[PDB]
Design a protein around this ligand. Structure first.
Ligand SMILES: CCCCCCCCCCCCCCCCCC(=O)OC[C@H](COP(=O)([O-])OCC(O)COP(=O)([O-])OC[C@@H](COC(=O)CCCCCCCCCCCCCCCCC)OC(=O)CCCCCCCCCCCCCCCCC)OC(=O)CCCCCCCCCCCCCCCCC
Ligand SMILES: CCCCCCCCCCCCCCCCCC(=O)OC[C@H](COP(=O)([O-])OCC[N+](C)(C)C)OC(=O)CCCCCCCCCCCCCCCCC
Ligand SMILES: CCCCCCCCCCCCCCCCCC(=O)OC[C@H](COP(=O)(O)OCCN)OC(=O)CCCCCCCCCCCCCCCCC
Ligand SMILES: CCCCCCCCCCCCCCCCCC(=O)OC[C@H](COP(=O)(O)OCCN)OC(=O)CCCCCCCCCCCCCCCCC
Ligand SMILES: CCCCCCCCCCCCCCCCCC(=O)OC[C@H](COP(=O)(O)OCCN)OC(=O)CCCCCCCCCCCCCCCCC
Ligand SMILES: CCCCCCCCCCCCCCCCCC(=O)OC[C@H](COP(=O)(O)OCCN)OC(=O)CCCCCCCCCCCCCCCCC
Lengths: 120, 347, 99, 171, 98, 115, 139, 175
């Protein structure tokens, strides 16, 4: 679908104009869940290797949380970019096409004839 | 095979698939497919057993035929348009021509007959490469040319893929044949949504990638190829059987596990495209995959099959493998549903 | 392509040959250089959906340029009626027909 | 869908040079530089006007300008022409290398008889500016109107309204 | 479209059928496969030569040198089958089955 | 016109030349006369068996080698290009890879084929 | 889908012979396709019994196609209700019963009665309402 | 005759293809295929493709199919399966001689053959283009661009060929 929009430079994970958006806050609930995923990998990582799960290689799972958080963070900015982009050119289109978006008439519920079905 | 030779052979196979995804010229698309084929056979030949020779021969004949049949689709499009650019092509017969040509490479329609047998003959590691990496290249062409496809022709091919792929899965003992039948079933899910919106065709791809890496490398870690052989693994390492049943449930698509994310989004898309009977039937056939999924889960960890006294040596020793990327694989393959709106990144 | 690396780093790998109106050795033309150049510039910065119908005239003309279907059918009908008439001895070809 | 307009055969009855190939090749060097002005005018028309029917008037001019080049040499040493083009004709590939003596004899007259000069190597291949009076064609390809490009994106990017807006996800 | 183009196109289609309609010698199958590409090589030359796609004169060799590569694989698999089984029959090449 | 005419003439010349070499000598073959000659002794029933791999291995190497040389026929016209440096680099590449294929094939036994 | 178009062109419960001819043609072609497949994947050891196998499959599929042709059309003709989905349901069950007769088993015939009759209603449900199975890309 | 000479060469091309596609003896199938290989070159030659036409003679007639004879000499099924050996091959050969004879007659009468594509049965010579090529043979200049513009293809074609030799010895090594 944004597959061929004008200006999309290929192989650009985060285009420069995306910087005009509010960056994800460092404790965004989506981000901490991404950090959860890093930790959850750590516990099982000692499980396959048959290590004392929780208290086993504090260095190992510590790196997992760091890696998942950053890769999560850049993903969230990119994710926020498209949704902002998807809504942006959306709005630019509807103003450019007034005839295809009529303003529906303002009638209150008093004049609307909605038939009533009893439950009996 | 010498590891340096093995590394190069994989390197070309990866580059050949990479070549397909990065070529704007139809000839180069074919170049990637053939040279990926040219190096796929020796990897299947690494074990060099008569079963493998039968498997590799079967794989080469179908892939070479599909690739050769692919040339006419390029030539006919050339003949009627004089365009080597990979875009919306300009001939219904040529469009039809390549669609089965690529489908045979993926193995969705009756074309799928090579997919199970080749996996059975060749080693577990080779099967992992064949069923995961070798599916990116044919999909790459379909994504680019999705706008030209006949909707009826592609939806059918997707239907029999999940239909037959799930149906025969109930009658498989060998885990390798189970995985391939699962692969054919999963092939239909991505291919069905392909004409409508390619974004979640990709989303299904990486997700379906995750379990198959998760399952196969778990199976390699188990060093088991049959259902009974898998059953004995509870005694040695009960924990691994526990994760496998999570992935087995996840790959089946039960919420909130990751495998539900593709199917849910797939149903949502064609529902937006007014196609509402089509999603319903695939969902009904989705339980067919879940059945032998449960049967494996019943045999693996949910129950406790009898073991053999010779298992006692396995307790004393330990695994020497490093199962690289296995920790993050299953976690990314079982609980990522809350991170669903990240699919817009693919767009 | 799926990953347009060519566009990103700007090294021409295949597009030099994807169409026939591009640079050609010794600057010699294709059969339909004039037509496909017209179609290409018609369908640039437009999009596949819009260019399918808007630049239809440039397309079938270009398709007819290299297929030459209706032109060949035109000649076939010309020839078919000729032998359907001269065999009846209704009109005789002039000397320049036979040299 | 129209008329393929073709000129009548009347204007095509132009005087044509009647000489064998070797005759042209033997005097080609002494022909190109000395009849360049009409030759360039005609071939400029061929590449600019891009249509054969437009350059009919110039087409007969070069043919005519060939004849008055092929007439004074008859009123001058046509005899060295004879064996020179005869010797060139003997060559299968019309190679100048074998027949150079007759080339010298041919060149000797035109240095004095008409006072021409042998063009040097590369001189004939030089791109030359031709001075014409015809206007340049407006649309030589007869291009039609061009489809209007779809309007470009504009305006500053704003945050997505109410987040992803995908099912229950608030952000 | 010119009558000749049918002859190559139909040549491919009947070559395609021979590749799929098997018998008992996958050696004979490989012949239909390389004949299959020969029509592809032949036909590609006609359009490219006809339309004066000068830079496209490339691919008839490129298609040749890659279709020829499959012969290396295919014939190599031939002798591999003809070593674990001795012969080049296809009905016996069903050890996979299950 | 002349090309296949030249081809046509040779084939008829060959066919008649064997035709008058076949019907003229008044063929008088018998069973023992037509029996296969095997160094003057009895044939044991053969010429229907596979021959290991060496003859096949060299054939494939020749085929692969023949394909690369096929890529480098157009060199005489390639030298007439405008950009020699690219052509010089590229043609050198084909030859050194042709060398490398020979180099590997040599090092890993290869041309010393099986016995 | 010209062969399929024949059935749609004939109005429901009108010109029953045409509907039967159109319906049995659909069944005959469908039986031919599956029979040709069955010959392919499963080798008919002797050629003559191969024609026997495809004969059985085509004869069956034609019978279901034919019987559904009448029962659907005559019911609409008799009851003067073309829009009624029940017209196909009885025909669907009628076709399923014919399958049981060909296989000579009440259980399979009963199972085919319910399933085919339900689907026969559903396809008529779609034709009336406008359901599309292979919807064109809309969004 | 020379009116429709390329009609002829295309016709032996079809019957040559029907030959080996009918699955005859692999040498006999090779014989039928090389016959098609021989006649196909003339089709390209008639279009000016001398260099392309001569190559298929070199690397396909004298190339691939020569090593094909080795496997036929290596296979050597216990009896020749020449055309007389089987009756299906005769039926396959006989059949493949009908429909192409049917549609040429179909195309020779009204020329409106609509098999898959619409096709004109007009003389082969028509679709040719009129125009001088000067001194540069268009076929030669196209191929010689291998080392001018076909840089990228040269690397990939060369690299695959190098990988072509590494696989062949590895699969044939038999562990
Ligand atoms: C999206 C999110 C999900 C995906 C995320 C991305 C990662 C995906 C892969 C995860 C890891 C997979 C893995 O390894 O599983 C274990 C699994 C089994 O590992 P194993 O038990 O050690 O056995 C492997 C060999 O059999 C052992 O044979 P060996 O004993 O001869 O050892 C060979 C081994 C040992 O390593 C070496 O020998 C190193 C190389 C030395 C020589 C060359 C040096 C110079 C070049 C270096 C290049 C690097 O090297 C290799 O196997 C070569 C391939 C890897 C290096 C080259 C990579 C490409 C360039 O790996 C494989 O079977 C490898 C398959 C090929 C790669 C993965 C393909 C599947 C994924 C495709 C889709 C990817 C996402 C696309 C989007
Ligand atoms: C590896 C050795 C071969 C490649 C490098 C040397 C040749 C470079 C070359 O031909 O570049 C052509 C072009 C650049 O062109 P160029 O500027 O060298 O020559 C242009 C010549 N005309 C004007 C006639 C078109 O670059 C490529 O094709 C790069 C391809 C990828 C190379 C790296 C792959 C890894
Ligand atoms: C979505 C629905 C659910 C989906 C997943 C369901 C999975 C299970 C489903 C059933 C599976 C089959 C039946 C059970 C199989 C059991 C497999 C097994 O191996 O069991 C025995 C094994 C013995 O334990 P052992 O490996 O020795 O490890 C002990 C801990 N060191 O046991 C093990 O190996 C298990 C080891 C578990 C270790 C848990 C460690 C927890 C650590 C928690 C840290 C919390 C930190 C909180 C911090 C708060 C402040 C921030
Ligand atoms: C100018 C500056 C440099 C000058 C040259 C310096 C290097 C000289 C190297 C000499 C050869 C290598 C060393 C040597 O003596 O090797 C001998 C060995 C013999 O092999 P063999 O006869 O088979 O017996 C043993 C195995 N059974 O050899 C081998 O086993 C090696 C086999 C290699 C096969 C390929 C060899 C090259 C083929 C031609 C390549 C193209 C031409 C040269 C291009 C060079 C590009 C840099
Ligand atoms: C979409 C096409 C899918 C084709 C799948 C082919 C393999 C699976 C079907 C199969 O093998 O047989 C199904 C059908 C009937 O088989 P039947 O004659 O009942 O014999 C069964 C016991 N051997 O035999 C067939 O060949 C019919 C398959 C397509 C049915 C529609
Ligand atoms: C409104 C327009 C249409 C009006 C007419 C009604 C529709 C057409 C007629 C009915 C078609 C569906 C009914 C089934 C027809 C095929 C029956 C068949 O193949 O029977 C043979 C066989 C079953 O017997 P078997 O299991 O082999 O046991 C004996 C073994 N010796 O078969 C098998 O073994 C394989 C399993 C059965 C075959 C696969 C499924 C075939 C049907 C698919 C749907 C067709 C829908 C057609 C109509 C819509 C499309 C046009």
């Amino acid at each position: 679908m944004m597959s061929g929009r004008p200006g999309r430079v290929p192989l650009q994970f985060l285009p420069n104009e995306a910087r005009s958006l509010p960056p994800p806050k460092l404790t965004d609930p989506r981000l901490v869940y991404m950090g959860f995923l890093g930790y959850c990998s750590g516990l099982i990582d000692n499980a396959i290797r048959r290590r004392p799960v929780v208290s086993a290689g504090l260095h190992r799972q510590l790196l997992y949380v760091t890696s998942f958080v950053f890769f999560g963070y850049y993903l969230l900015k990119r994710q926020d970019y498209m949704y902002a982009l998807r809504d942006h050119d959306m709005f630019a289109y509807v103003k450019s096409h007034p005839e295809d978006f009529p303003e529906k008439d303002k009638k209150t519920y008093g004049e609307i004839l909605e038939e009533f079905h009893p439950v009996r | 095979m010498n590891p340096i030779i093995y590394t190069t052979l994989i390197m070309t196979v990866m580059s050949g698939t990479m070549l397909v995804m990065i070529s704007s010229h139809w000839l180069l698309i074919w170049i990637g497919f053939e040279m990926n084929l040219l190096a796929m056979i020796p990897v299947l030949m690494k074990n060099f057993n008569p079963r493998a020779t039968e498997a590799a021969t079967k794989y080469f004949l179908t892939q070479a035929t599909a690739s050769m049949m692919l040339m006419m689709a390029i030539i006919i499009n050339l003949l009627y348009s004089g365009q080597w650019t990979i875009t919306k092509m300009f001939n219904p017969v040529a469009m039809t021509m390549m669609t089965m040509a690529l489908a045979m490479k993926l193995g969705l329609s009756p074309f799928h007959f090579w997919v199970p047998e080749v996996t059975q003959g060749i080693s577990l590691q080779a099967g992992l490469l064949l069923l995961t990496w070798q599916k990116l290249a044919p999909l790459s062409v379909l994504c680019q040319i999705s706008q030209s496809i006949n909707p009826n022709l592609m939806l059918t091919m997707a239907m029999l893929s999940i239909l037959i792929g799930g149906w025969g899965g109930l009658n498989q003992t060998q885990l390798r044949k189970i995985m391939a039948y699962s692969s054919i079933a999963h092939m239909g899910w991505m291919t069905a949504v392909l004409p409508y919106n390619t974004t979640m065709t990709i989303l299904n791809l990486l997700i379906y990638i995750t379990m198959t890496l998760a399952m196969f490398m778990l199976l390699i870690h188990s060093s088991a190829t049959t259902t009974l052989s898998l059953s004995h693994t509870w005694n040695k390492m009960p924990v691994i059987t526990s994760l496998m049943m999570v992935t087995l449930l996840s790959m089946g698509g039960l919420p909130p596990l990751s495998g539900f994310m593709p199917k849910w989004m797939i149903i949502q898309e064609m529902t937006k495209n007014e196609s509402i009977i089509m999603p319903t039937l695939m969902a009904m056939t989705a339980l067919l995959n879940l059945y032998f999924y449960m049967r494996l889960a019943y045999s693996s960890s949910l129950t406790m099959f009898p073991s053999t006294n010779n298992m006692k040596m396995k307790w004393q020793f330990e695994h020497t493998k490093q199962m690289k990327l296995l920790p993050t694989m299953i976690v990314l393959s079982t609980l990522v549903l809350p991170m669903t709106p990240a699919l817009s990144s693919l767009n | 392509p799926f990953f347009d690396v060519q566009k990103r780093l700007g090294l021409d790998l295949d597009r030099w040959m994807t169409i026939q109106s591009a640079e050609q050795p010794h600057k010699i033309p294709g059969r339909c250089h004039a037509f496909e150049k017209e179609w290409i510039e018609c369908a640039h910065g437009i999009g596949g959906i819009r260019a399918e119908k808007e630049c239809k005239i440039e397309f079938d003309d270009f398709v007819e340029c290299l297929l030459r279907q209706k032109t060949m059918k035109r000649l076939s009908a010309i020839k078919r009626q000729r032998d359907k008439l001269i065999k009846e001895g209704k009109y005789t070809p002039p000397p320049h027909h036979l040299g | 869908p129209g008329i393929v307009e073709l000129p009548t055969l009347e204007d095509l009855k132009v005087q044509e040079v009647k000489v064998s190939s070797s005759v042209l090749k033997a005097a080609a060097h002494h022909y190109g530089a000395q009849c360049d002005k009409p030759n360039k005018e005609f071939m400029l028309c061929r590449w600019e006007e891009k249509d054969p029917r437009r350059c009919l008037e110039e087409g007969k001019l070069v043919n005519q300008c060939a004849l008055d080049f092929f007439r004074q040499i008859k009123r001058h040493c046509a005899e060295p022409f004879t064996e020179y083009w005869t010797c060139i004709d003997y060559s299968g590939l019309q190679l100048f290398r074998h027949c150079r003596k007759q080339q010298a004899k041919f060149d000797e007259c035109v240095l004095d008889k008409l006072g021409w000069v042998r063009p040097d190597l590369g001189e004939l291949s030089k791109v030359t500016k031709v001075k014409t009076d015809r206007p340049l064609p407006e649309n030589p390809y007869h291009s039609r109107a061009r489809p209007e490009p779809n309007p470009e994106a504009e305006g500053d990017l704003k945050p997505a309204k109410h987040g992803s807006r995908l099912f229950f996800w608030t952000m | 479209m010119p009558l000749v183009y049918m002859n190559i196109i139909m040549a491919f289609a009947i070559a395609l059928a021979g590749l799929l309609m098997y018998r008992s010698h996958l050696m004979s199958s490989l012949l239909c496969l390389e004949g299959m590409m020969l029509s592809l090589f032949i036909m590609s030359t006609l359009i490219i030569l006809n339309t004066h796609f000068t830079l496209a004169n490339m691919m008839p060799i490129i298609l040749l040198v890659f279709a020829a590569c499959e012969a290396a694989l295919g014939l190599s698999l031939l002798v591999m089958v003809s070593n674990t089984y001795g012969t080049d029959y296809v009905q016996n090449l069903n050890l996979l089955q299950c | 016109m002349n090309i296949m005419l030249t081809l046509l003439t040779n084939v008829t010349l060959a066919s008649l030349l064997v035709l008058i070499a076949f019907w003229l000598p008044q063929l008088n073959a018998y069973s023992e006369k037509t029996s296969p000659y095997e160094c003057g002794f009895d044939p044991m029933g053969s010429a229907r068996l596979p021959f290991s791999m060496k003859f096949f291995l060299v054939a494939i190497t020749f085929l692969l080698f023949d394909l690369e040389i096929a890529l480098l026929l157009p060199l005489p016209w390639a030298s007439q290009t405008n950009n020699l440096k690219t052509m010089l680099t590229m043609a050198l590449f084909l030859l050194i890879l042709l060398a490398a294929s020979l180099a590997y094939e040599w090092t890993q036994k290869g041309l010393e084929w099986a016995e | 889908k010209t062969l399929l178009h024949k059935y749609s062109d004939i109005p429901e419960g009108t010109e029953c012979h045409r509907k039967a001819y159109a319906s049995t043609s659909i069944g005959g072609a469908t039986g031919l396709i599956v029979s040709a497949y069955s010959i392919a994947l499963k080798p008919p050891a002797s050629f003559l019994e191969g024609v026997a196998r495809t004969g059985r499959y085509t004869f069956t599929s034609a019978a279901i196609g034919a019987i559904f042709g009448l029962t659907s059309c005559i019911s609409a003709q008799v009851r003067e209700k073309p829009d009624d989905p029940l017209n196909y349901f009885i025909g669907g069950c009628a076709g399923g019963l014919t399958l049981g007769a060909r296989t000579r088993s009440y259980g399979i015939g009963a199972a085919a009665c319910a399933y085919m009759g339900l689907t026969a209603a559903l396809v008529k449900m779609g034709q009336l309402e406008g359901w599309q199975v292979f919807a064109e890309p809309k969004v | 005759m020379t009116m429709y000479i390329a009609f002829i060469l295309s016709t032996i091309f079809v019957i040559g293809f029907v030959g080996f596609s009918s699955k005859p003896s692999p040498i006999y199938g090779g014989l039928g295929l090389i016959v098609s290989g021989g006649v196909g070159c003339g089709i390209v030659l008639n279009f000016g493709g001398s260099f392309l036409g001569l190559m298929v003679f070199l690397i396909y007639l004298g190339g691939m199919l020569v090593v094909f004879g080795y496997t036929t000499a290596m296979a050597t099924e216990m009896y020749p399966e020449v055309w007389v050996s089987n009756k299906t091959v005769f039926g396959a050969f006989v059949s493949g001689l009908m429909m192409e004879f049917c549609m040429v007659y179909y195309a020779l009468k009204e020329e409106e053959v609509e098999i898959i594509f619409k096709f004109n049965g007009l003389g082969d010579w028509v679709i040719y283009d009129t125009g001088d090529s000067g001194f540069f043979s268009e076929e030669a200049m196209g191929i010689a661009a291998l080392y001018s513009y076909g840089t990228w293809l040269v690397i990939v074609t060369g690299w695959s060929l190098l990988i072509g030799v590494v696989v062949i010895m590895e699969i044939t090594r038999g562990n």
